[model samples]
Target: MEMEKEFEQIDKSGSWAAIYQDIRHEASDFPCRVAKLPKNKNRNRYRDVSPFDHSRIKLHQEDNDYINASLIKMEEAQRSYILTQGPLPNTCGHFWEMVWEQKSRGVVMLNRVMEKGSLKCAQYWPQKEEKEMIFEDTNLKLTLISEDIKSYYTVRQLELENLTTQETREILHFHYTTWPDFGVPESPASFLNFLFKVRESGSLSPEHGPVVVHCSAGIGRSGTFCLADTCLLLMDKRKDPSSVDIKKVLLEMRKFRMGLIQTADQLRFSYLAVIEGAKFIM
Candidate 1:
């Protein structure tokens, strides 16, 4: 009820930006460790964005095998997510390598290849059926097994192979096509439907490895998706939709990945989606 009142007031007063800023300032205490790692400076897509050193997921194969990825685990909600940036052209191999190395079951992509005429994420997955794409840099290969297209999202079954070991694994790619880069979705209803579809697939379950979530910088839209899903799960477990503090939960998530929620609009959109999702769980 307190969270509900806070949400309502923020929504009515259009003061989420100020509230979000306050929360961000609180999170500033968390160390940005990876930014100092000499290796991440060049590996990151954006010079300014880097994974925190404490939570950074390291690749074991080689010294410079680090990717701009972080493991965000929320024990109370029983959810674990890997938030990382979109693959750069050179880091495409590293991206798949990280997925394979981490044993991730699925990748929730929130940005398009090109948004507003700028490259958000590289075409990391295979484009044609049975046409394998090889990343010599990481010694990995990817092939598209099947694809299901919808108006808002597309689901693809991809086979990832380790060229060195000749090992393979099936990875699901849930691509939300309509999510605008650096913006929120059109409506929480459609977004919730998409979230449920990902949940239904069992990819986000405990049985699998952490679900890899990414947008352009791995903070904005990616953070929103993870935050909303975790909140909905908490509501289901607690049997009270308002039991969790949305801002508090987000701050916890930000500890693992710097800047989980990117914008005030996105923070507001997350509350909308979480509230709408609670209706079904209730």
Candidate 2:
């Protein structure tokens, strides 16, 4: 009956704070909610994982075709990075748009993008293509795991499954951080650990091409990962690594694009990422 009353108290309050208040009031001596608050929320916002700050970076405001071709040029010029507006159709048309522009030739990792409560129609073209893209190279791998990872997004996951063939890269599965429903924390320790794996494995180089990372806009989870990688590399440089300016990396990102860091949380994440990343570097 007391337990039943406790639930009644929660239903009356409506908010979590009210619920917390009732719980604390009901059982002051229960030793519950004693833990110190976590300094971090463990959320991955797009701005958190980007290499550049927002003030300098510019968004791609043009039509899709124009921007697509432009990214190809940027890649061909080896601008080092590129950004896209939203989900890519499975035809590998968008993928090729970027690849044709990149100067450094390497493999491509197909990261898929699928969001919840969104449209589930369309086989994404390639799913119905005449000659379905196969995994030609056995060495190439494409692995997809749940988003309990640093940044969770189902839409992108499905896209990855569709785009990657054994010919792409030897697929490996990972849920580097947490489970879905919780979303992804931009600066989770598990995420950094995975990045360290990438760094240690030297998978970020030209020969490896770029790992496909997507979630809806590809700005939050994907950008954060890319940004973290760029900044971490700067942090790791032995030759005057300390002298390396973090903003310079952000500036480069802006030179290529805009809204590099979109939120205060993302900025905080980058700063925090550095604080924790130092341990990895040393």
Candidate 3:
């Protein structure tokens, strides 16, 4: 299509820096006072990355309704996502509690638990030896029923149990291990392959609650994943795919959270992912 060709030329012409800069200045000016509160300081992973108060997901079960998470909705695509930082040791229980409360079908983890010898995300779920781990604060227990490890990622089936009622539910954990901290997957082929695999098992449609998407700070690779998925889905619905502005859609998403697609390189990668992914729908 001419639309993809146009982006392809721009991608090859080295013009993404200009495109990324414009979109960066286009969104996110709301107040985010909750993450700054003295009581909720430790709940946040980074000092500057905080959920906007207006779009933050409130915890109904906890007295302090803070979880460093934001709800981003693409109304036209009929899709919703909860983008957040990696769970801190203290907030791991709250992470599971939010998962339990949101009725999310899957967790799209874009970073590893340890990246570059740095502890990026907490080990919130159970592993092989430890089948079950209890979050005493939220009275939630996660049991790893099965794990499927592929070349670049791991898919785990976890049973989330609410000890209060002895109730349980199945959740899919999609963990992409090869994506570097500030970079993207080596190839869009692999990323798109994994993306479809995830959407295949867990429906990307609006039937279930918003799927939880997270990385170290939930703004870089996390943003890239959501942007690529949303653009491809939107293209599937449009009569003319070029009518969808990738930057505009990301600007819309950044209103719900801040500093999405942190680097110009990450921004370029999403365009590539979407351009390649458009072929699948075409």
Candidate 4:
């Protein structure tokens, strides 16, 4: 019944981030801050396997921002961003893009999205500015466990380029056999490890500001990622800093933007994620 109720809460709630702050407070004890950005929806079409027909999932709003591609001015670094579809020259690969605002330490995060050309796989060459951009690679020991889960490869490849060691390289390709389960390896702890590695490597480094995160469309996976990270970060800080009121934290996150719930389920999922993870940790 509790599980059913929780599912109902998740399914029907418009704001998937419904209990965002409450979860944050239960998990941590620090002042939470978040910057909201406009939503960017990607038009990603997938074939549905319904008995009726092959239905396409409608494109939703963008969820988060990529650190490298989005960061422009450091002053606006804390702002939360949304991911949307960018200019596609050709119908080769369905790609994702994000806009970021990194603080004072102007780093480079954008890597060129290569296409299959007559020469090789990476046909399009990175521009001068792109080449000049500094990458963030916080190597905290992570693995590519999300199989069949489409990610924003552009940023991932950029992270690879800037990464220092071939030995330090963790797997990026996630296929069926080694696919990460929903609440297993893909949990927030694992996600934190990945982000820590990214920051340590220098891409999503919090040195300048909060690390940016986004997927192709930005809603489903990206929004969940953003909320999860926000929850964990707050938890870590609260343990070290002072106690924090979640309502205040959620209010702060909302001040930057509103409607963090990319989907009805995702909004509720954050609550479960924070509550379950906090119980484990605390």
Candidate 5:
């Protein structure tokens, strides 16, 4: 009943838009100089979405390179995440290179290959049933070990190899297929369930490098995922789920990237998920 009431309150006041607007207003104060870097224009999946210069991730050995990827670190929350745009047909090799360089344990994908009759993301990873995929541009190879397809999401195990040095490491791919572009999930329960499943694998933990998260542009849905996860972790730690300020946290997160929580609906959904998830921890 309390949860339902909280939803009703957000619905009645229609303040999600106002809150979202406030975030955008605050975000304008931060500099987004990197998005304008001549090298990054072609790499971005969308012209309007680019990583801020201060937080953009750089490839170690690549030549004349730019990828629309950002490192979002929340020191207080003990969370580190690489927020990046979906890999383009041309940038697939760079994507794997970033993962290999960052030493990420997993990639949390929030969109599918196609949505609303458009190509949202490239087929970046090797097909689940295939033996392996080779990216000649980055001198990397990805081998599929196993895949488990569920109703709403698919989990696949992949092995990334540095062809030059012959070094290899395992990576988990968590793909949520049902999340629509520019919309919220049907319910927070399922989203949280998938989140915890990723959590169970220990991929999002601090001991490992930052987990790579992406959607089409890597801002809207990607930001929502990071925000909700961070809020829940804060709630769990403080023993009072409601103590963390949702608006304040969102603002803090935006300092690392541009235009997070892109819509009022996503903003509202974040609140719902946080509140619902609190019930489990409390």
Candidate 6:
């Protein structure tokens, strides 16, 4: 009733102010000392958005262990996610190192390298088939083996190799290319379609390491994707889908990472996706 009524109240006025009020306090400051440090500052893509120190991912690098990413764990669903910002130019090596160290099977990227005439993410992967990237910082090399392109998104097969160990692994790169500015896709249906597509791959299952989810700030669209997916999983457990309260689930998620579902638009889109996905779950 809380989430449905939240949808109704926002739908009636089309402002979503009430929903915003419920969660705006999440943006308040907390003990994110790692991000505020001068040495670790450049790794962050957005100054205002920082991973909470306790939840932030710590790399094995002894000298510099910080990356702007957070680990969100769901005990009920038996799932874990690492929400993070798109990589900065200098921090690209650290990003791959985090992936390799975390044992992540796949990465879910929710934005393009560039959007709205500006940079959103670094060109972290190899663009041409013959080219490869060797990040000395992480002692790893990545080669692009194959790519599948759809209208709205692309999946790339990345072969990651440890330069010293002579071992290699295949990594899945799930890239959604058409997210709008500060809003979701043009339609919630397509977003859900993409979400369901990713789920079918079984890349996010608990059998594997946590899949990495990222957007420009690593908070807005990233939060929506995780929130909708988590809620639908809950629906599968209960006989009635509506028994899941969207807001409460998001609040729980926010406890792991700050400022999730950053905008009223994404907040609204999350509700719509969960509502749309509920029928599909049945």
Instruction: Give me the candidate number with maximum lDDT.
Output: 3
TM-score of 3: 0.95
**Per-residue lDDT over 207-234 for candidate 4, one digit per residue giving the tens place of the 0 to 100 score:** 4433433332223344454555455556
RMSD of 4: 13.9
Q: Estimate each model's TM-score.
A: 0.94, 0.48, 0.95, 0.38, 0.93, 0.94
lDDT of 6 by residue, 140-188 (tens): 9999999999988898889988788978878888998888765566568
Cα RMSDs of all predictions? 1.7, 16.7, 1.5, 13.9, 2.0, 1.9
Off by over 4 Å in 5: 1-8
Q: How much lDDT does each candidate structure score?
A: 0.86, 0.37, 0.88, 0.32, 0.85, 0.84
- List, residue by residue over 1-282, the lDDT tens digit for candidate 5: 344466677688977788678778877445557667787677777877777878889888646556788899987788989999999999999999999999999999999899989998889887855657899989999998899999889999999999999999999999988896556887888888888889999889877889999988898889888998998888677755456887788888888888787888988888888887877765
Model 6 ranges with Cα > 4 A deviation: 1-6, 13-15, 26-29
Off by over 4 Å in 2: 1-79, 90-92, 96-116, 119-187, 208-213
Ranking by lDDT: 3, 1, 5, 6, 2, 4
Query: For residues 74-108, what per-residue lDDT tens digits would candidate 2 score against the true structure?
Result: 23223243444332333244343333233223221
lDDT of 3 by residue, 1-282 (tens): 655776778778988788888887777689999889999988999998999999999887748978999999888887889999999999999999999999888999988889888999899899963658999999998999999999888999999999999999899999988886555666688888888988998646577778999999999988988899988888889898778888889999998999899888888788889988887665
Flag clash pairs in model 3.
none
In Å, residue 141's CA in model 2 sits off its true spot by 14
| Clashing residue pairs for model 6 | none
- Off-target runs (Cα >4 Å) in candidate 4 are 1-202, 239-251, 279-282
What's model 2's lDDT at 7?
32
TM-score sort, best first: 3, 1, 6, 5, 2, 4
